Structures are given as structure tokens and as C-alpha cells.
Amino acid sequence: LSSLRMAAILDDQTVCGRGERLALALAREQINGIIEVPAKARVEVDIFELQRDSQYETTDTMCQILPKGVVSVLGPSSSPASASTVSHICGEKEIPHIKVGPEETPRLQYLRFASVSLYPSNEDVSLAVSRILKSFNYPSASLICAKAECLLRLEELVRGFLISKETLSVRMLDDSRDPTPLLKEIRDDKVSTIIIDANASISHLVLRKASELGMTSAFYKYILTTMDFPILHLDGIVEDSSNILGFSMFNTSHPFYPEFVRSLNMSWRENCEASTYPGPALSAALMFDAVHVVVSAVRELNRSQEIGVKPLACTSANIWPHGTSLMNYLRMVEYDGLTGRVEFNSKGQRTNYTLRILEKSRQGHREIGVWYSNRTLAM
Amino acid sequence: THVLRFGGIFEYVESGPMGAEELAFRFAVNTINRNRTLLPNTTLTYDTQKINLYDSFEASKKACDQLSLGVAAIFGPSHSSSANAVQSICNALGVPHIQTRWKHQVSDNKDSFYVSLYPDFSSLSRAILDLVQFFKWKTVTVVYDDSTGLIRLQELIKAPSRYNLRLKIRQLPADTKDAKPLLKEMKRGKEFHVIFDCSHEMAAGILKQALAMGMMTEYYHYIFTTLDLFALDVEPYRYSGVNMTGFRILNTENTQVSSIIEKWSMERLQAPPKPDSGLLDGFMTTDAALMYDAVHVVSVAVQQFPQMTVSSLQCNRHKPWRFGTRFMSLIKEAHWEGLTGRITFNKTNGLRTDFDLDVISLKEE
Amino acid sequence: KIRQLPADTKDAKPLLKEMKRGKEFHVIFDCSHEMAAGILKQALAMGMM
């Protein structure tokens, strides 16, 4: 109507976090700052901090959000439990949920689908690990899953291999969180490539313990999948012999990436400089990029139609009237931004996306090339 | 004198007016009331709603409605997303949730006021591991329905790293019951031993397709995790010599078991499956059986606990239930020798991983 | 090797069981085609097909 107001949901903290509050705000500042003619509908981003990853709390938040009459519900960033409840509520209400984290639910396709996921799909990363391993001539790998939800995230990778000691075997972290017996088995069976998968911190723990068990040398290739890989900084774990490789989607060349990383650099020390700031973690960008996604599609629909927001109550089944239309317009939107190209397939996932690989060096990154979404691995 | 009510949140079934699980719940409360040994001074009332399938917002609305009416437990549902939604409502509101089918548990999810009753697929898959070694299989192929993740087979996937097993995982076509390209790949690969992991309604179809594709010979040995294997009909293939070997939890040896099974079947409560599918009649499937046990294990804990009554509980404006910790502990410490063997719970996570299985196999009879 | 069909019935299950036990794999069946259909159903459910 007169303000395309949308609703954040940030599972992240406000102190020493991925800074998503700041990034969503920066994007808002950048858009309502870029003055165009005629003077348009503003963009306001309403922000809702969520405490736990409990579906019950989320239902409370979404019932606190639907009255605000919001075009979409960004996030929740890293709460894969809460994601299915938001997606379920908004697929009930016909209001798009622009997911920014992965989905570790099974995600039945027959489920009510009106969700666009700016985050690389789990099949798509699985194919990237498959095709990096096809570049390394299929060594007898061994996958180190953090939780068991690794296996649902890297599902197609697993199926496409004769699971044994000789092609690919799965080990998982125990409840002790001490990977040293696992690396001792891996070193036992002469296992050349290790495919570590976790959040970024358990990634550091497997690598530091590995660096001490003397398993970071010239022979070992570690295809880390934790797609937060730009913020991992390793000291005493990275040698020029060492061959750790992650993926990262940031299009650093986009003009805003330097300035945004400066803004997220400023509001890191002020909350706390207790550790040095390891760089912009991915969810800041996906949120910054997604606010551009939803503003662009809503702006197009605001042209060919006129969209009214209605005080929607989770009690009454009143449905946003234009929702499936906005859905259609969202699935064709394209924005080239900090997260790279943002184009969506019919299934509501992301395609034509560039995961720029990194092989780490003694200080940082060496772009050893790109795994494209379609033309797979032109590295 | 005492009234005490349970809630149920069951699925919409096109099989008829009452689903198998729902029929069992309705049949269970009545059977547990008409027994005089158990809940003597009290009685049960049961508020059973239905939902559509995959409807987590409606399921959470239902659970808010029932808990606003005043319940002491919320049984069902079955599908994983609706299951998890009700779990979280209940965990904050303090009222014990007693699922029945295996849901996928999120490993973060710190919630404790839930108890499951399906024998948990970690330990069940560990049983399948002990079976693969007994037959000295070296090569096995696991075929899983996509709806269930490979997570319930996580011990089978960790298993090749600790023995010599050349696993290979293939996916049943989920959109179809017709898995012939898969089966032809399985045969050209000479994948003789297969661990099917699918609901038995899929398993009847897969076995039937197999006979047509001539994979039902005395070579193949098909292990099935589906705990309804005995309720599958095997007379089309009994003489073939295919060595199917599955698990079975129902205590059909015991006479109280076999008469309760008889009552449930000869009361026409179930809906007759047609002979096209190759499935059978008159069987209480495992799903329903666990439910008959579930009403009891909760009602045993009720009978042990005299002074709790229900109370009306609004969602998001009311405290944890004032009796939730007490009632939940008693549900977790109940040893009840039900239809599906003993029922007792691994007290860490409220799951169930102690249970006495019967391996069944296909002899020529 | 010549084996007689059961003239008592169509339930050729014993005969088919000997045929399989003896590793006989090539069979020239001479029977009217109603009996051919019967023997083929009982060959399928005998895992000889």
C-alpha cells in the first residue's frame, strides 16, 4: 500500500553475532536512500528477535507478526526447526517466506510450498561435493557428519557411492564432541579426503584436533562444506601443504561488498572485540540480498496490480489476497547482489547460483574456481 | 467419579470415518474402561480431533483447543511435521505427549515431555545389523522410501566403516508404487541381498513387482524393517524359496494378545483391504497395536497417580502444567507388558529402545 | 528326460519341484493351452519363471 512493510525473524543475538539486524537495517537504509522518481512506497523492515529454536515460540511470534500486515517473513536464519513452522504458517496464509537458512527437514514436495530459499539447496551442495570428488578422481573418502542431519543434508552425495571403506564411509561425531578417535580411524584406513560437515565452530574443532593428530599435511584433502567458509580463520592449522577447501557464495566484486563488510566491521567491535572479527558470515548477506529480492518482486506486483495488506489474524483464516501472485512474481525475480545471482526455479529453490570455491592459504583465500549451478564445475 | 480426558489428534483418512489408529484409540479407551483392574475409581473421556495431512498450523491450533479444554495427554499424530508441532506446544505447556509412529527427532530439540512408543530406529537398525552379520552378507543394498530420511538408517550407514560391508543405497520411486526401473537396475547389478525399509503398503507392492521381474527366486534374500511383515500375505511366493526375513514385534503367541487381536478384527472396526494389493485382512497392524498399548501405559501411570486432575490451559498465556513433571516421570517409569512386548523407556530421552523382537522368516509353509 | 504331467490334477507343484531340483532348465511342454496357462501360473509361483 503506502509502505511495503515486511517482517524479519532473527534467531541471531544482537551482540557479536552474524549481525543480521545490522545487515537488514543497512539494506533498508540503502533502498529507502536510493531516491527514485516518482517517490515510491517506502521500505520498512520490522524486526523480531526470537529466543529459542522452539516451534511454540515461533507460532507466538508469527501471531505477533501477521497483524502488522507484512509482505514477507525473512528468516529465520539458523533455526531449522523453527523454519518449518514459519513456512507452514505462511503457506497457510498465502504470504511468501523468503527462507535464508538451509532446510534440514525432509521437506516433502507435496507439502504446501510457497517458500523461496535464497540458501543453496541441499541437493545442490551435495552435487558440488560430488563433482569436486569427481575432480579428485574419487579417492576413498570419509564423511564426518556433525549431527545426523548431515545425512539428510548431504543425501544425494551418499546415495551416489558404494558405501564402504574403499569409496565412502560415514563417521559421525559422538556425543563427546571429541573427533580424535575418528581421525585415528581415518588415518588407519588410509583415507585421503575427509569431507567435514558441521557448523563453523565444530569445523574448527575437527581441524585443530586434526592438525595436532598430525593430519593436516600434504596428503590430506579436506572438502569442508560448511558454507560459512569465509569466516573461518585458521592459525596453526593452515600450511601451504594443507589442502582445506570450502565453498563461499559472496560476489566480493559487487560494489557494496567492501562497504558492507566495513559496516559489519564497525558494529562488531562496538558490541564486542573480544575476538577479532572474522568477516561477514553468510546469513548477513543472504538477508541483505533477500530484502532486495522481496522489495523488487513486490515493487513489480505493485505496478501491474495494486496490493493491499490486511490485518491478518492467525485465528481467522483470512488469506492475504494477492499472495500466490506475489509468489509467481518472486519466482521470476533476478537480483545480482552480495550473494551472487539470485534467480529461482519453479520448485521455489535457487538456480544459476555460483558457489565460488576457496582453497585456503596461510593467510586466507585462493579462489580455485567456481562450481556453477547448471554448467557444473567450470573450475 | 473422577473424569480424566485424553486428547487425540489424528489424521483425515479416506479409508473411512475412523482411521486405524483412531479406531484403536476409541476402542482402547472403551476397553480400558470396561476392565475393572485398571482405573477403577476414574474413567476416560477422549476428545479426538482430526486434521488434514501435513497441517502443522492446524495441528497446533487443535492442540491449543484441546489443552484449552483441559487434557492430561495428547496422543497422535503420525506425520512427522504435525508430530513435532504438537510436541513443542506440549513441552512448553507441560502436558505429556505420547506419540506412536516414529518421527524424526531434531537433534537440537531439547524437549522432554514426550514419550515415543515405536521401537526406535537406531536400535532397530542395530538389530538389522546383527542380522546381516548372521547371514554373513558382504554386499547389501538398502532401498528407502524418500518420505523417510536415511536418518532412521543411520546405524546402517555408519555400519560399513566398522565391518567389511559394501553397502549401496537406492531410492524407491516415491511418487509411484511401480519400481520396475529400480528393480531392473538392482537385478542387472546382481544386488542379491536387499534391506527394504518402507511401510508395508509399499512392501506389498515392491514384493509383487519383484515376482513379475523374476527377482523372487531362491537366490535373493530380502530383509524388511517393516514391523508389519507378518500381516503381509506371502502365499503368492511361499514356494518360490525367496528367503525374506523381517522383524516382528507383536506378541501373537500370547493368548491375551491373540484374543485382543481377534476382538479388534472381528468387530469389523478395520476397513477391508482389497486383494489387488496382496495385503491381508483381520490384522491389527503395528501402528494401531502400539496405540492400544499407548493408551494403557499412560493409563497405568494415571492409575498410579491419584490426585492429578486436568486443568484448562491457554497457549502462551498460561504456565507449564502444574503437574507435568510429576505425571511425565510416572509415564517414563512404567513397565507394562503390553501387546507389543514390554513397554519401558530409555530414561534419557524418553524414547523406547528396550523391546523384545521376534525375527520372522519365510519358511515354505 | 520325460516327465508326465499330473493326470490327477493341474497342481503340478511336485513335478515342478523335481524339475527345479534336478537343475532341468530347458523344458519342452506338450499340453493343450489351458493346461499351458495353468502350468505357467504354477511355474511362476514356484520361482521357475
Residue numbers in the entry:
A (entry chain C): 21 to 399
B (entry chain D): 33 to 397
C (entry chain B): 200 to 248
Task: Reproduce text from the manuscript describing this model.
We next pursued a desensitized structure of GluK2/K5em to understand how the receptor may reorganize to close the channel in response to the sustained presence of L-Glu. Purified receptor was incubated with 1 mM L-Glu, imaged by cryo-EM, and the structure was solved by single particle analysis with no symmetry applied. The data was processed using a similar approach to that used for the antagonist-bound dataset, and we first resolved the full-length L-Glu-bound receptor to 5.8 Å, then independently resolved the ATD layer (3.8 Å) and LBD-TMD assembly (4.3 Å). The most striking feature of the GluK2/K5em-L-Glu structure is the LBD layer, which shows rupture of both LBD dimer pairs and exhibits an apparent fourfold symmetric subunit arrangement. Although the LBD layer gives the impression of fourfold symmetry, close inspection shows that the G helices of all four LBDs come together in a staggered arrangement to render the layer twofold symmetric. Critically, this arrangement is reminiscent of the ‘desensitization ring’ observed in the desensitized GluK2 homomer structure. Furthermore, close inspection shows GluK5em G helices reside ~3 Å closer to each other across the twofold symmetry plane of the LBD layer, compared to analogous GluK2 subunits in the homomer. The analysis showed that relative to the CNQX-bound structure, the L-Glu-bound GluK5em LBDs (A/C positions) are turned in plane by ~18°, while the GluK2em LBDs (B/D positions) are rotated by ~110°. Meanwhile, for GluK2em (B/D) subunits, the M3-S2 linkers extend ~12 Å further from the membrane in the desensitized state. The desensitized GluK2/K5 structure helps rationalize this functional role for GluK2, suggesting that it is the GluK2 subunits which undergo large conformational changes to facilitate channel closure during desensitization.
Kainate receptors (KARs) are L-glutamate-gated ion channels that regulate synaptic transmission and modulate neuronal circuits. Each subunit has a modular three-layer design with an amino terminal domain (ATD), ligand binding domain (LBD), and transmembrane domain (TMD) which forms part of a common pore. GluK4 and GluK5 cannot form functional channels on their own and are obliged to co-assemble with GluK1, GluK2, or GluK3. Here, we report structures of the GluK2/GluK5 heteromer (GluK2/K5), proposed to be the major KAR in the brain, in resting (apo), antagonist-bound (6-cyano-7-nitroquinoxaline-2,3-dione [CNQX]), and agonist-bound (L-Glu) desensitized states.
